[PDB]
Amino acid sequence: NVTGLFKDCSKVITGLHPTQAPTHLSVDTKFKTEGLCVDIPGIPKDMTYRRLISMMGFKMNYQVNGYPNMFITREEAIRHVRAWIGFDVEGCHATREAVGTNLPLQLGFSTGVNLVAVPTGYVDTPNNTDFSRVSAKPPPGDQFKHLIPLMYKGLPWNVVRIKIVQMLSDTLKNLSDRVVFVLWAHGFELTSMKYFVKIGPERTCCLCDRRATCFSTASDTYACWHHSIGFDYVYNPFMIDVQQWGFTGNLQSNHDLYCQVHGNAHVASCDAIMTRCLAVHECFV
Amino acid sequence: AGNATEVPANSTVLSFCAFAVDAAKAYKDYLASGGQPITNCVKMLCTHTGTGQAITVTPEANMDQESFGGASCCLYCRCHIDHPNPKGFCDLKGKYVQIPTTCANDPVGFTLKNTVCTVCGMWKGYGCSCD
Ligand SMILES: Cn1cccc1C(N)=O
Ligand SMILES: [Mg+2]
Numbered sequence A: 001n002v003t004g005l006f007k008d009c010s011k012v013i014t015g016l017h018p019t020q021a022p023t024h025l026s027v028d029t030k031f032k033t034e035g036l037c038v039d040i041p042g043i044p045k046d047m048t049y050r051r052l053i054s055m056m057g058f059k060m061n062y063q064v065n066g067y068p069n070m071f072i073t074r075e076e077a078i079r080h081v082r083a084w085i086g087f088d089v090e091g092c093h094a095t096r097e098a099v100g101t102n103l104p105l106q107l108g109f110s111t112g113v114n115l116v117a118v119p120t121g122y123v124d125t126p127n128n129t130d131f132s133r134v135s136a137k138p139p140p141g142d143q144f145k146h147l148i149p150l151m152y153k154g155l156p157w158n159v160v161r162i163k164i165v166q167m168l169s170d171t172l173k174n175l176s177d178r179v180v181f182v183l184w185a186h187g188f189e190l191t192s193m194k195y196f197v198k199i200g201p202e203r204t205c206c207l208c209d210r211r212a213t214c215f216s217t218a219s220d221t222y223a224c225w226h227h228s229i230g231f232d233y234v235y236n237p238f239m240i241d242v243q244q245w246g247f248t249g250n251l252q253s254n255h256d257l258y259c260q261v262h263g264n265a266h267v268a269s270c271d272a273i274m275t276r277c278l279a280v281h282e283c284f285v
Numbered sequence B: 001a002g003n004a005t006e007v008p009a010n011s012t013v014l015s016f017c018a019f020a021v022d023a024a025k026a027y028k029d030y031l032a033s034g035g036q037p038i039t040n041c042v043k044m045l046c047t048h049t050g051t052g053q054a055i056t057v058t059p060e061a062n063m064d065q066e067s068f069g070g071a072s073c074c075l076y077c078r079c080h081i082d083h084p085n086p087k088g089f090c091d092l093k094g095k096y097v098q099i100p101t102t103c104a105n106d107p108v109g110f111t112l113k114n115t116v117c118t119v120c121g122m123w124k125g126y127g128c129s130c131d
């Protein structure tokens, strides 16, 4: 049995040399024998490869003392309804040098904000993993023809994650000591969170006694929503998947049963608005 | 399309360490909370008549060690995250690591917690001859 998490998306037929493969599964077939690997002097390592690694398939079910859980129960999410932010990501497909994974393209929030990012992937090399721009194409079809211009209007992820932190901080500083991302089919949103979320034990703000909701890589410091100017990461966020509440149809058909004032403009923020709207009607009526 | 690199047994630990601010502390805390060590490492079939050196260009396991492909023993390589040194480059990827047989159940944890003697090339506390 295998997972799709960290799936190698390069088009190279051969696997990796035993010294360079992250796992036994990704070692080239030539070196495999008796459930183990052999070193073959004369078959050298590859010193120029670029292998796009998939970030699709994360599982946040860790049970570690002192580390809060990202995914919360419906009852805990209800208690923190002031912290609710609907979140949806429209993606694009890896192309040319890689195939098999989706990259964040348009990030939508229930605040009405849409942020367009440069298609970026985690590319394995002989020395490390390079977080760099990758070739990508908008998904095949006409329900996604609005994503074609967005392929050239994207911002680098270092700017995108500062903008998310600023938007969340301005929205939530007077509402909650937290963020609860309200999702519908969380898979790709969780993948996208890898790009702007950090987790760890509960910390306090550098400038006050409130719990830390933001983290800065530049200074190795933490801040609440009031003192997060310049911060690039969302620290210890919470989230829930509304799809898993027993709904049968798609997002729009379930949202439309209770609400007639949020038409589907087929954009990331619209799906995020509908997700939070549906969660409110289902939880409080 | 594409080729799987991982098994489901590693999903939880790798997802946890992939999102952590401090991945090394996250893995040590994961193990301390009863978590299972990272599996699916590159274990080598070797003669066990090697030098016993810790990090080598070819497998050098002696009769008290197992040899592994270095990238597969590196938490940062396994999680596809930044490496903690200033140049952001790996010292294990591209080499073979010799792990004592007693600690072969957790190659990733062994390399995270131990140091190689710069004088004799053996692991400190596990074959390092000098005092
Ligand atoms: C199985 N596998 C995993 C990563 C690359 C490969 C390959 N091309 O053999
Ligand atoms: Mg969706």
Ligand SMILES: [Zn+2]
Pocket (backbone or CB within 6 Å): A205, A206, A207, A208, A209, A210, A223, A224, A225, A226, A227
């Ligand atoms: Zn503060």
Ligand SMILES: [Zn+2]
Pocket (backbone or CB within 6 Å): A255, A259, A260, A261, A262, A273, A274, A277, A278
């Ligand atoms: Zn609505």
Ligand SMILES: [Zn+2]
Pocket (backbone or CB within 6 Å): B071, B074, B075, B076, B077, B078, B083, B090, B091, B092, B093
């Ligand atoms: Zn490494």
Ligand SMILES: [Zn+2]
Pocket (backbone or CB within 6 Å): B117, B118, B119, B120, B121, B122, B128, B129, B130
């Ligand atoms: Zn020594």
